[PDB]
Design a protein around this ligand. Structure first.
Ligand SMILES: CCCCCCCCCCCCCCCCCC(=O)OC[C@H](COP(=O)(O)OCCN)OC(=O)CCCCCCCCCCCCCCCCC
Ligand SMILES: CCCCCCCCCCCCCCCCCC(=O)OC[C@H](COP(=O)(O)OCCN)OC(=O)CCCCCCCCCCCCCCCCC
Ligand SMILES: CCCCCCCCCCCCCCCCCC(=O)OC[C@H](COP(=O)(O)OCCN)OC(=O)CCCCCCCCCCCCCCCCC
Ligand SMILES: CCCCCCCCCCCCCCCCCC(=O)OC[C@H](COP(=O)(O)OCCN)OC(=O)CCCCCCCCCCCCCCCCC
Ligand SMILES: CCCCCCCCCCCCCCCCCC(=O)OC[C@H](COP(=O)(O)OCCN)OC(=O)CCCCCCCCCCCCCCCCC
Ligand SMILES: CCCCCCCCCCCC(=O)OC[C@H](COP(=O)(O)OCC[N+](C)(C)C)OC(=O)CCCCCCCCCCC
Ligand SMILES: CCCCCCCCCCCC(=O)OC[C@H](COP(=O)(O)OCC[N+](C)(C)C)OC(=O)CCCCCCCCCCC
Ligand SMILES: CCCCCCCCCCCC(=O)OC[C@H](COP(=O)(O)OCC[N+](C)(C)C)OC(=O)CCCCCCCCCCC
Ligand SMILES: CCCCCCCCCCCC(=O)OC[C@H](COP(=O)(O)OCC[N+](C)(C)C)OC(=O)CCCCCCCCCCC
Lengths: 105, 132, 90, 61, 491, 158, 49, 69
C-alpha cells in the first residue's frame, strides 16, 4: 500500500526493520566490541534517511531494506530457549485445568 | 524466501467446497495469539483440501534456499571430491607398496583355509610363500 | 506310543483304494521329516566343531561343512503331491 | 496399597504357573512320562481314526 | 458330537432367547422385568453361549492327535461330512474366542434391540466356525455365503451415518464375487461328480481347465482377503459397521479367505497354483505397497486401521503361496496374531474414543497421553505389535512369511521386506500424533479406559505375546497339517 | 427375595418427594423374571429405572461371567498347550531316527550303550546343551550313514 | 578375556519350523563381553548422572 | 502452584512428582523383590548355563570329520 511518513503505523514499520537489522548483526557477530561497532553503523544508516516527506522515495528503501535482510539472514539465528523456536519451548507444559466430566460408557 | 512445498496444487474445484489459497501453517508467526496455540490455528478456520500436507504434523519445510540451489551445492561438494579421487586414479599418484604382500607357508595355508586336497588349493590358498 | 511308519510307495498301490493311498501319502511325509531330523543332528555336529576348533575350524570341520551344504537342498519337506501326481519314469 | 487388586494378579498367575509346571514335571516321573492332564482323556490313535476315514471315503465314493 | 452339539445347543439357545424377549408383545403395552437395565439378563445369556461354544471345541481338542496325518473327529450331520485337521483346529479356536469379546465390546453402546444383536453375533460366529470343519466345496460355499444375511442386516440396523452404503457394499461385493467361486465349485461337481475334499485332491485336470477353475476361485478369494484392485468394500464397511461387527469382519472373515487357499487351490489345483504364484506375488506386493501409502493420507480414525488390515493380509497371502513350510507356517501364525491385534485396535479407535467423543476425524485427537495414560499405553503397545515388533506374534508371522517369500522367489519375493518399514509409517504416525503434543483443545477431559475395556485389551494382548515368545504352540499343531500342502518333485 | 412391599417403601419414599431429577437390599432371582405376574413386575420397573434417575463403570453385569466363565477357559487352553501329550511330527521323527539306529546297529555295543543309558526326557536336546550327557557316538553314527528310505519309497527314476 | 572361557544360557526354543531352528540362547564370547564393558559401565554412570 | 489433577490421573509411574505417603514401607517391600529375584536369577544362571568349548573333546570331533568322509 501507500507509505505515509510520520504516521504512527509507518514508524512502527521502521521500528520493525530495526529489530531485523540489529538481531541479524547480532546473529553473525559474536563479539560485543565488534557488534557495537556494526550496530552503531546500522543506526547511522537508519538515521541518515530519517527525514523523508515523499511516499515513493520511501517505498524503494522498504523494497531495498527487505532485500538487504534476506541476503544477510543468518542460517541459524540465536533464539532464547523458552521462546518459540528455542531449545526448551513447550517443554513440560503444565496440564490443562478443567473438570473431568464423567461419562457412563 | 517464503515458497510453498512441492506438489501443492495451484487450482482446485471440488464443487461447493470453498476455494482458498494454500497457507503453510508451519510458517505462521509463533507469537501471535491463536485458539489452538500448538497447531497455530484458530477455531472454525477453513482448511485447504490438502491441509494435511500444510500443517505442523506434515514434514518440516525448509525455505532458506531454493530446492534447485540445494542440489547445485550438494552435487558440487561431492563433485569436488570426485575430481580429487579421479585425478589420483587417472594420474596414479598414490604410492606403490614398500614391501611384497604378506606370504604364507604350508602352501599358503591352503589346508588351514578350508581346503581338503591339492587339486583345489588355489581356491582356498592364501598368498603362497614360494620363497622358504 | 511311537507309531511305526507304514512303509508304502505310490508305485505299488491302486489309488482307487483310498485307504492304501492314504498310507502312501503318510509314508512319504514321515520319511521326509526324518531327513530334516537327520539334518538338524548333522548341523549340531558342525556347531560343536566350530566352537571347539576356533582358528582350526576350517580343517577340523571340513567334511561336516561339506556334507551339510550337500544335504541342505534335499533334506527339506516337499510333500507328496509332487510324487503322487507325477511319473518320473515317463 | 502395593498389594492392591491389580499388582497382585500377575504374580498369582506367575507363581501358580511355575508351581504347576514343576508339579507336572514331577508327575511325569511317577506316571511313566504321562502329563498332568492325562486324566482328561487320551490321544486318538491311528488305528481308531483309520476306521472312520475308510467309512467316510467309502460313503463318499 | 462336535458339530451336532455345536448346532443343536446354539439353535436351542437362539430359541430360548427369542421366547424370553417376545413373550410380552401381545396386544397390551409391556413393562416387564427382562427389559430392566437394558435387556441385561438377555445380554448375559448371549454372553454365556459364547463362552460355552469354546467349551464344546475344547472337549474335542483334547482328543486331537498332532502326529496323525488326515482329518480327525470325522462325523456326518445333515448328510454332510465334517472333520478337523491341524490347520482348521486353530482357526476354529480363534473364531470362537472372538465370540465373547465381540459381545462384550458392545455391552452398553447400542441404542436398543440388544437381544437381536446378541443373537446375530453368536449366529455369525457359529457360521464362520463351522466353515473350517466341513469337507466339501459345496458345504464350504454354503457356510461361506450364509454369513451375509445377518451381517448385512447387522451393519444396516446398527451402523454409523453411512450404514446404508456399508450394507450395500458387503452384500454385493462379497456376493457378486463369491458367485464366481460357485461356478468353479459347480464344474467340479459336473466332471468329477463329487465336491469332497479328499476325493478331488487326488484328481489332476487339464492345464487349461485348471486355469479356469483357479481364476474363478481366486476371484472369490481376492475379495474376501481384499487384494487390490477389489478392496474398496473393506475400508467403507469398517468405518460404518458396529464395533462388534468390525471385530468379526476383521478378526475372522478375512482369515476365511486364507483358509480358502488351503482347501480349494493348493491341493487340487497344485499345478496351476505354481503358474499363478508369480502373478499372485505381483498383486500382493502391489497391495502391500499401495495400501501402506494410501493409509498415509486418510483422516477417519477407523478407516486408518482398516487399511492396516489390508497390508497384513497381503503379506499372509504372499507367505501361503510360497511353496515351503516356512512360508505356510508363517502365514498361518500371522493370521492368528493379526486376529487379536486387529480387533484390539478397533476397540482403541472405534470403541474407546468413539464411545466418548463420537467423532472419528483424526484432527480432534492429540496429546491423549496426558489425561488418558492407560489408553496411551495400550495404543503404544498395540502399535508396535501391529508393526511386527520382535516380541509379538506378528513378527514371527511376518518374518517367516517374508523368509518363505524369498525362498520361493528370491528376486521379487524380497520386496515383501518393505512390509517392515511401511507398516511403521502409517501406524507410528497415527500413534505419535494421538499421544503427542499438548492435549487437544477440541476434546474435554473424561474417564480413562474403563474396567471392561481393560479386560478386552488385556485378553487380546496376552495371546499375542505368547505366540510371539513361544510360537511352537501353534507350530506343533500345524507342522504335519501344513506339510501336505507342498508341491515339488526333486530328482 | 422379591419382597413386594420393599418396592412400596421405595414407592412411598419416592412418593413423599415427587420432585425428580433433583437401596442396597434389592436383589432379584431367576424366578421373578419368569414366574412372577405382570402387575407385581409392573411396579418394579418404575422403582429401578427412576432410582438411577436421581444420580464409576463398575458392576455392569459382565464381571461375574467373564471372570468366572471366560478366564478359566483360557487357563484350560493355556494348560492344554503346556501339559498335553501330543507328539508333533518332528519330535516323532527324532525318536524314529534314533530308534532306527538301534535296529540298524544291533551289532554295535557302544552305540546301544549310549542309547540305553539315555533318559527319555533328554531326547530333544542332543548336542551341546546344559545336560551333562555323552552323545558323541550317537552323533557320530548318524553322520557316517543315512537312515531313511525316501529313495526306498520311490521306485521310478528318469 | 583372560581365562579363555565361554558362557551360554539357552532359555528355550523360539522357532522350530522344519530345519530353521532358533533358540532363546545367550552367549558371552570375547566380543560379547568386549561390548558389555562399554555398554553397562557407561549406562550405569549415565543413570547415576 | 499448578494442579496435577491427581484425583483421577493415576498412571503406573505416578505423574508430576508423585510420592505416596507410605513410600518408605513400600520400598522395603520392593527392595526385597529386587533382592529376591537377583538371588533367584543367580541360582538359575549357575544351574542352566554351560561352557560351549568343553562339551566335546577334540578326540570326538576327529572321528566326526572322518565319518562324514
Ligand atoms: C525410499 C523412500 C521411502 C519410502 C517412504 C517415503 C516416506 C513416506 C512418509 C513417511 C511418513 C512421514 C511422517 O511420518 O511424518 C513426518 C515425519 C516428521 O519428520 P520431520 O518433519 O523431518 O521432523 C523434523 C522435526 N524438526 O517424517 C519422518 O520423520 C520420516 C522419516 C524418514 C522416513 C524414512 C524415509 C526413507 C529415507 C531413505 C533415505 C536414504 C535414501 C537412499
Ligand atoms: C506376567 C506373569 C505371567 C505368568 C505366565 C508366564 C508363564 C510362566 C513361566 C512358566 C515356566 C515355569 C518354570 O519356571 O519352569 C521351570 C524351568 C525348568 O527348566 P530348567 O531346565 O530347570 O531351566 C533351565 C533352562 N535350561 O526352569 C526355569 O524356567 C528357569 C529358567 C528361567 C529363565 C528366564 C529368566 C530370564 C527371563 C525372566 C527375567 C525376569 C525375571 C523377573 C520377572 C518377574 C518374576 C518375579
Ligand atoms: C427329539 C429327537 C430329535 C430327532 C432325532 C432324530 O430323528 O435323529 C435325526 C438326527 C440324528 O442324527 P443321525 O441320524 O445320527 O445322522 C445325522 C442326521 N442329522 O438329528 C437331527 O436330524 C436333528 C437336527 C435338526 C436340528 C438342526 C437344524 C439345522 C438348522 C440349520 C443349521 C445351519 C446349517 C448351515
Ligand atoms: C526398503 C527396502 C524395500 C525392500 C528391499 C528392496 C530390495 C529387495 C529386492 C532386491 C533383492 C536383492 C537383489 C536381487 C539380486 C541379488 C541376488 C543375486 O545375486 O542375483 C544373481 C542371480 C544370478 O547370478 P549370476 O551368476 O551373476 O548370473 C549368471 C548365472 N549363470 O541373478 C541375477 O543376475 C540378478 C541380476 C541383478 C538383480 C536384478 C533385480 C534386482 C532387483 C531390482 C528391483 C528394482 C526395484
Ligand atoms: C500384558 C501381557 C501379559 C502377558 C505377558 C506374557 C509374558 C510372559 C513371558 C513368557 C511367555 C510364555 C512362554 C512360557 C510358556 C512356554 C514355556 C515353554 O514352552 O517351555 C518349553 C521348554 C522346552 O520344551 P520341552 O523341553 O520339550 O518340555 C516342556 C514341557 N512343557 O521347556 C522348558 O524347559 C523351558 C522352561 C522355561 C524357561 C523360562 C521361560 C521364560 C519365558 C520368558 C522369557 C522368554 C525368553 C526371553 C525373552 C526376553 C527377551 C530376550
Ligand atoms: C513380563 C511383564 C509383562 C507385563 C506385565 C503387565 C501386564 C500384566 C497383566 O496384564 O496381567 C493381567 C493378566 C490377566 O489377568 P486378568 O484377571 O484377566 O486381568 C484383570 C486384572 N484384575 C484381576 C485386577 C482385574 O495376568 C497375566 O499375567 C496373565 C498371564 C497369561 C494368561 C494365560 C492365558 C493364555 C491363553 C492363550 C495361550 C495360547
Ligand atoms: C518385581 C519385578 C517385576 C515387575 C513386573 C510388573 C508386575 C506388575 C504388573 C501389573 C501392573 C498393572 O496391571 O498395571 C500396569 C498397567 C496399567 O493398567 P491397570 O493397572 O489396569 O491401570 C489401572 C486402571 N484403573 C484406574 C481403571 C484401575 O497395565 C497395562 O496397561 C499394561 C500394558 C502392557 C505393558 C507392556 C507389555 C508388553 C510386553 C513386553 C514383555 C513381554
Ligand atoms: C444357527 C442358525 C439357526 C437359524 C436361525 C433363523 C433365524 C430366524 C429367527 C427368528 C426369530 C425372531 O423373529 O425373533 C426376533 C429376534 C429377536 O428379536 P428381539 O430383539 O428379541 O425382539 C425385538 C422387538 N422387541 C425388542 C420390541 C421385543 O431376532 C432375530 O430374528 C435375529 C436372528 C435372525 C436375523 C437374520 C435372519 C437371516 C436368515 C437367513 C440366514 C441364512
Ligand atoms: C522389553 C519390554 C519392556 C516393557 C517395560 C515397560 C516399562 C515402561 C512402562 C511405562 C508405563 C507408563 O507409566 O507410561 C504411561 C506414562 C505415564 O506418565 P508419567 O511419567 O507417569 O506421568 C504421568 C502423567 N502424564 C501421563 C500426563 C505424563 O504416560 C504415557 O501415557 C506415555 C505414553 C505411553 C507410553 C508407553 C510406554 C510403554 C512401554 C513400551 C512397551 C513395549
Amino acid at each position: 500500500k501507500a507509505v505515509v511518513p510520520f504516521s504512527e503505523a509507518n514508524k512502527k514499520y521502521v521500528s520493525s526493520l530495526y529489530r531485523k537489522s540489529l538481531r541479524t548483526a547480532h546473529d553473525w557477530i559474536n563479539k560485543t566490541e565488534f557488534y557495537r561497532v556494526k550496530a552503531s553503523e546500522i543506526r547511522s544508516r537508519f538515521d541518515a534517511n530519517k527525514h523523508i516527506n515523499d511516499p515513493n522515495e520511501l517505498k524503494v528503501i522498504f523494497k531495498e531494506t527487505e532485500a538487504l535482510l534476506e541476503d544477510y539472514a543468518h542460517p541459524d539465528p540465536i533464539i532464547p530457549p523458552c521462546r518459540p523456536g528455542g531449545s526448551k519451548f513447550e517443554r513440560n507444559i503444565p496440564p490443562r485445568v478443567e473438570a473431568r466430566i464423567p461419562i457412563d460408557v | 524466501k517464503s515458497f510453498l512445498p512441492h506438489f501443492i496444487p495451484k487450482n482446485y474445484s471440488y464443487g461447493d467446497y470453498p476455494r482458498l489459497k494454500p497457507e503453510n501453517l508451519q510458517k505462521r508467526d509463533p507469537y501471535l495469539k491463536y485458539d489452538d496455540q500448538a497447531n497455530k490455528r484458530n477455531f472454525n478456520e477453513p482448511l485447504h483440501p490438502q491441509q494435511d500436507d500444510l500443517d505442523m504434523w506434515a514434514p518440516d519445510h525448509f525455505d532458506f534456499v531454493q530446492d534447485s540451489i540445494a542440489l547445485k551445492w550438494f552435487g558440487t561438494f561431492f563433485g569436488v571430491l570426485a575430481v580429487f579421487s579421479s585425478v589420483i586414479y587417472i594420474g596414479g599418484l598414490y604410492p606403490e607398496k614398500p614391501a611384497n604382500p604378506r606370504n604364507y607357508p604350508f602352501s599358503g595355508l591352503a589346508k588351514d583355509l578350508g581346503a581338503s586336497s591339492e587339486e583345489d588349493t588355489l581356491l582356498y590358498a592364501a598368498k603362497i610363500d614360494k620363497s622358504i | 506310543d511311537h507309531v511305526r511308519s507304514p512303509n508304502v510307495s505310490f508305485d505299488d498301490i491302486d489309488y482307487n483304494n483310498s485307504q492304501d493311498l492314504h498310507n502312501a501319502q503318510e509314508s512319504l511325509l514321515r520319511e521326509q521329516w526324518i531327513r530334516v531330523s537327520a539334518l538338524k543332528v548333522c548341523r549340531k555336529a558342525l556347531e560343536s566343531c566350530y566352537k571347539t576348533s576356533g582358528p582350526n575350524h576350517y580343517e577340523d570341520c571340513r567334511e561336516i561343512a561339506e556334507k551339510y551344504l550337500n544335504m541342505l537342498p534335499d533334506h527339506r519337506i516337499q510333500g507328496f503331491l509332487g510324487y503322487q501326481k507325477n511319473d518320473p519314469s515317463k | 496399597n502395593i498389594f492392591n487388586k491389580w499388582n497382585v494378579t500377575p504374580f498369582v498367575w506367575l507363581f501358580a504357573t511355575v508351581g504347576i509346571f514343576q508339579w507336572d514335571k514331577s508327575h511325569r516321573e511317577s506316571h511313566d512320562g504321562k502329563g498332568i492332564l492325562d486324566f482328561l482323556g487320551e490321544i486318538k490313535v491311528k488305528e481308531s481314526l483309520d476306521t472312520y476315514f475308510k467309512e467316510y471315503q467309502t460313503k463318499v465314493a | 458330537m462336535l458339530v451336532q452339539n455345536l448346532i443343536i445347543f446354539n439353535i436351542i439357545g437362539i430359541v430360548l432367547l427369542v421366547l424370553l424377549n417376545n413373550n410380552n408383545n401381545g396386544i397390551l403395552n409391556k413393562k416387564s422385568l427382562l427389559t430392566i437395565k437394558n435387556e441385561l439378563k438377555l445380554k448375559q445369556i448371549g454372553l454365556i453361549i459364547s463362552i460355552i461354544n469354546i467349551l464344546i471345541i475344547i472337549e474335542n481338542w483334547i482328543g486331537f492327535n498332532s502326529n496323525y496325518y488326515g482329518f480327525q473327529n470325522i462325523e456326518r450331520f445333515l448328510n454332510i461330512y465334517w472333520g478337523i485337521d491341524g490347520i482348521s483346529l486353530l482357526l476354529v479356536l480363534l473364531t470362537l474366542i472372538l465370540g465373547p469379546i465381540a459381545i462384550l465390546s458392545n455391552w452398553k453402546n447400542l441404542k436398543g434391540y440388544y437381544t437381536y444383536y446378541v443373537i446375530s453375533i453368536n449366529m455369525l460366529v457359529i457360521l464362520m466356525a463351522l466353515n473350517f470343519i466341513c469337507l466339501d466345496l459345496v458345504s464350504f460355499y454354503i457356510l461361506f455365503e450364509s454369513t451375509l444375511a445377518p451381517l448385512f442386516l447387522l451393519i444396516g440396523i446398527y451402523g454409523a451415518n453411512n450404514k446404508n452404503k456399508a450394507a450395500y457394499y458387503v452384500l454385493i461385493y462379497t456376493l457378486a464375487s463369491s458367485l464366481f467361486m460357485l461356478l468353479s465349485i459347480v464344474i467340479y461337481y459336473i466332471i468329477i461328480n463329487s465336491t469332497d475334499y479328499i476325493y478331488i485332491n487326488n484328481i489332476i485336470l487339464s492345464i487349461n481347465l485348471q486355469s479356469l477353475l483357479f481364476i474363478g476361485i481366486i476371484i472369490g478369494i481376492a475379495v474376501k482377503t481384499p487384494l487390490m484392485p477389489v478392496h474398496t468394500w473393506l475400508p467403507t464397511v469398517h468405518s460404518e459397521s458396529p464395533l462388534g461387527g468390525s471385530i468379526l469382519l476383521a478378526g475372522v472373515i478375512l482369515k476365511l479367505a486364507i483358509y480358502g487357499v488351503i482347501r480349494l487351490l493348493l491341493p487340487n489345483l497344485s499345478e496351476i497354483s505354481m503358474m499363478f504364484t508369480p502373478i499372485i506375488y505381483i498383486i500382493s506386493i502391489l497391495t502391500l505397497i499401495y495400501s501402506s501409502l494410501i493409509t498415509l493420507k486418510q483422516t477417519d480414525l477407523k478407516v486408518i486401521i482398516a487399511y492396516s488390515s489390508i497390508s497384513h493380509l497381503a503379506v499372509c497371502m504372499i507367505g501361503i503361496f510360497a511353496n515351503n513350510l516356512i512360508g505356510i507356517n508363517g502365514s498361518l501364525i500371522l493370521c492368528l496374531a493379526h486376529g487379536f491385534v486387529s480387533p484390539a485396535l478397533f476397540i482403541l479407535v472405534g470403541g474407546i474414543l468413539y464411545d466418548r467423543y463420537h467423532n472419528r476425524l483424526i484432527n480432534y485427537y492429540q496429546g491423549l497421553s496426558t489425561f488418558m495414560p492407560i489408553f496411551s499405553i495400550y495404543l503404544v503397545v498395540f502399535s508396535f505389535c501391529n508393526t511386527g515388533t520382535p516380541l509379538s506374534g506378528n513378527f514371527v508371522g511376518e518374518f517367516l512369511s517374508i523368509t518363505g517369500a524369498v525362498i520361493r522367489h528370491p528376486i521379487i519375493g524380497s520386496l515383501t521386506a518393505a512390509s517392515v518399514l511401511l507398516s511403521a509409517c502409517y501406524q507410528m504416525k497415527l500413534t505419535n500424533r494421538l499421544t503427542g503434543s499438548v492435549f487437544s483443545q477440541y476434546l474435554h477431559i473424561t474417564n480413562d479406559v474403563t474396567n471392561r475395556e481393560i479386560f478386552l485389551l488385556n485378553w487380546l494382548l496376552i495371546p499375542t505375546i505368547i505366540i510371539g515368545i513361544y510360537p511352537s504352540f501353534v507350530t506343533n499343531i500345524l507342522n504335519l497339517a501344513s506339510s501336505t500342502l507342498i508341491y515339488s518333485v526333486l530328482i | 427375595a422379591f419382597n413386594l412391599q420393599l418396592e412400596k417403601e421405595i414407592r412411598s419414599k419416592i412418593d413423599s418427594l415427587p420432585k425428580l431429577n433433583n437401596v442396597t437390599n434389592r436383589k432379584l432371582s431367576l424366578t421373578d423374571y419368569l414366574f412372577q405376574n405382570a402387575a407385581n413386575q409392573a411396579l418394579y420397573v418404575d422403582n429401578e429405572a427412576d432410582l438411577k434417575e436421581l444420580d464409576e463403570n463398575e458392576n455392569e453385569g459382565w464381571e461375574k461371567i467373564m471372570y468366572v466363565g471366560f478366564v478359566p477357559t483360557m487357563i484350560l487352553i493355556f494348560a492344554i498347550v503346556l501339559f498335553k501329550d501330543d507328539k508333533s511330527i518332528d519330535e516323532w521323527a527324532m525318536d524314529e531316527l534314533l530308534l532306527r539306529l538301534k535296529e540298524k546297529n544291533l551289532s554295535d555295543v557302544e552305540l546301544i550303550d549310549e542309547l540305553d543309558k539315555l533318559s527319555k526326557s533328554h531326547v530333544g536336546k542332543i548336542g551341546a546343551s546344559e545336560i551333562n550327557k555323552r552323545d558323541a557316538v550317537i552323533i557320530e553314527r548318524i553322520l557316517n550313514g543315512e537312515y531313511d528310505q525316501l529313495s526306498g519309497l520311490k521306485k521310478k527314476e528318469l | 578375556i583372560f581365562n579363555e572361557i565361554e558362557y551360554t544360557y539357552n532359555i528355550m526354543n523360539w522357532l522350530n519350523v522344519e530345519y530353521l531352528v532358533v533358540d532363546w540362547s545367550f552367549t558371552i564370547d570375547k566380543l560379547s563381553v568386549s561390548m558389555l564393558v562399554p555398554v553397562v559401565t557407561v549406562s550405569f554412570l549415565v543413570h547415576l548422572y | 502452584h499448578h494442579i496435577h489433577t491427581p484425583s483421577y490421573i493415576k498412571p503406573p509411574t505416578g505423574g508430576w512428582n508423585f510420592t505416596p505417603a507410605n513410600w518408605k514401607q513400600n520400598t522395603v517391600l520392593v527392595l526385597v523383590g529386587f533382592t529376591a529375584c537377583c538371588v533367584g536369577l543367580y541360582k538359575l544362571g549357575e544351574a542352566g548355563s554351560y561352557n560351549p568349548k568343553l562339551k566335546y573333546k577334540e578326540e570326538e570331533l576327529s572321528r566326526w570329520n572322518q565319518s562324514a568322509k
